[PDB]
């Protein structure tokens, strides 16, 4: 699907035979008062059968909230020590704001 997004569409049933790509789950915690343009850490954990994520590069991934909307986009270089979990220091860039009740009330 990602290759189709760039103009390369393999015929159906074609086996890519990829060995340098691993599917992962990306998680970020959005601090309070997070504004668009800021960067937050992301934790990258492998969910398939990859032996190691060391030296990898996270491709563009959209981070969704509990309401199903995208609030950040994560990329960057993984720093792994468990070789299947890595961290990125500024992986996710905040793209949207979450309203706050801080200024309300007496």
């Amino acid at each position: 699907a990602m290759l189709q997004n760039f103009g390369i569409q393999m015929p159906p049933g074609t086996k890519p035979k990829i060995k340098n790509v691993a599917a992962v789950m990306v998680t970020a915690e959005l601090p309070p008062f997070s504004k668009p343009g800021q960067q937050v850490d992301v934790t990258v954990s492998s969910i398939g059968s990859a032996k190691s994520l060391r030296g990898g590069t996270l491709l563009q991934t959209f981070l969704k909230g509990l309401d199903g909307q995208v609030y950040a986009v994560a990329q960057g270089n993984l720093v792994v020590s468990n070789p299947t979990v890595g961290l990125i220091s500024s992986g996710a860039t905040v793209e949207r704001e979450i309203p706050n009740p801080f200024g309300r009330g007496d």
Binding site: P32, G65, L66, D67, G68, Q69, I98, P99, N100, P101, F102
Partner: protein
């Protein structure tokens, strides 16, 4: 007028003794589910809403109208 142009007018049985069913009967038409209300996250500062959360591991059986 009461007839729509796009869809058109949708509007010997005594010798038959039976009345044929009509396609589109409201007594058998499906019910479109009610739209859930918006969360308004500005009240709590969180994106959590009890009516809007989706469990990642549920099988998604039918559980509501529609």
């Amino acid at each position: 007028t009461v007839v729509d142009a796009v869809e058109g007018d949708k509007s010997v049985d005594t010798l038959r003794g039976r009345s044929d069913p009509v396609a589109g009967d409201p007594a058998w038409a499906p019910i479109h589910p009610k739209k859930k209300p918006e969360h308004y996250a500005a009240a709590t500062g969180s994106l959590f809403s009890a009516e809007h959360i989706t469990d990642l591991y549920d099988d998604s059986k039918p559980r509501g109208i529609g």
